[PDB]
Structures are given as C-alpha cells and as structure tokens.
C-alpha cells in the first residue's frame, strides 16, 4: 500500500482539472469536499489571492458527489462553470475525500 491505505483524498488549484482514480474494481464515493479557500499555504498564489483563509461552499460537494459517485474516475474542473462563486478575488482551490468500494457485495 504506497498510499495511507485508507480513504483518498486529492486537493487541486482553482481553475484547473482534477482526476479521481479508485484502484482495482472499485468505485469512488465522495465523502466529503469543498471549493474556496481555507488555508494560505495551498496552491502557493499572489499574497492577496491568498490571505483570505476563510471560504466556504457547501454545495461544492453535490457537484463532486455527483461526478464521482460510483465510478471507477472522474475528472473536473476545479472552477470556471463547473464551481460557484463564493469568494470571487481569492485563489480557491478543491478539496475531497473519497473511499473506493466494490461495485457489488463483497
Ligand atoms: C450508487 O449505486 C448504489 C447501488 O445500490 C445506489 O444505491 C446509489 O444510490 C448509487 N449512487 C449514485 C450517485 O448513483
Ligand atoms: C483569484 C480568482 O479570481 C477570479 O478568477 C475568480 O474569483 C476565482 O474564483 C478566484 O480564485
């Protein structure tokens, strides 16, 4: 297990495609994510992009939930049409955490 070898997450910069893999048969099952910004240390941008470290959007995880869910990949946009506009002026990024599970049982 190169990985933690337990829930996986990706995290990608505003405005640019992001690509979900689950390993072997399984598919992805969105958990839990966001679209904004809540650190300054990610997706090293201008200083001004980043020192709101408070942004929020909720809804950004049906979107990814519905793209992702059972299914093997997905990929997406990190922004443009595909995300909201909670904090326009801040460099956002996306954040989600998945488990991949069989398509079936067992
Ligand atoms: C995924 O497949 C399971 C199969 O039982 C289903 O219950 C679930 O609603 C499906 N979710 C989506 C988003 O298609
Ligand atoms: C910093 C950048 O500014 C505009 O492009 C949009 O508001 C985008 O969502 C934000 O991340």
Same mark, same amino acid.
């Given at each position: 297990?190169?990985?933690?070898?337990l829930?996986?997450?990706?995290?990608?910069?505003?405005?640019?495609?992001?690509?979900?893999?689950?390993?072997?048969?399984?598919?992805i099952?969105?958990?839990?994510?966001?679209?904004?910004?809540?650190?300054?240390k990610?997706? #090293? $941008?201008? =200083?001004?992009?980043?020192?709101?470290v408070?942004? /929020? %959007?909720?809804?950004?995880?049906?979107?990814?939930?519905?793209?992702?869910?059972?299914?093997?990949?997905?990929?997406?946009?990190?922004?443009? #049409? $595909?995300? =909201?506009?909670?904090?326009?002026?801040?460099?956002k /990024? %996306?954040?989600?955490?998945?488990?991949?599970?069989?398509?079936?049982?067992?």
């Amino acid at each position: 297990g190169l990985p933690f070898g337990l829930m996986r997450r990706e995290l990608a910069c505003e405005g640019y495609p992001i690509e979900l893999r689950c390993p072997g048969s399984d598919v992805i099952m969105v958990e839990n994510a966001n679209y904004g910004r809540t650190d300054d240390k990610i997706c #090293d $941008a201008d =200083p001004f992009q980043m020192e709101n470290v408070q942004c /929020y %959007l909720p809804d950004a995880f049906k979107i990814m939930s519905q793209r992702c869910n059972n299914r093997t990949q997905c990929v997406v946009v990190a922004g443009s #049409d $595909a995300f =909201p506009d909670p904090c326009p002026g801040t460099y956002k /990024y %996306l954040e989600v955490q998945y488990d991949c599970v069989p398509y079936k049982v067992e």
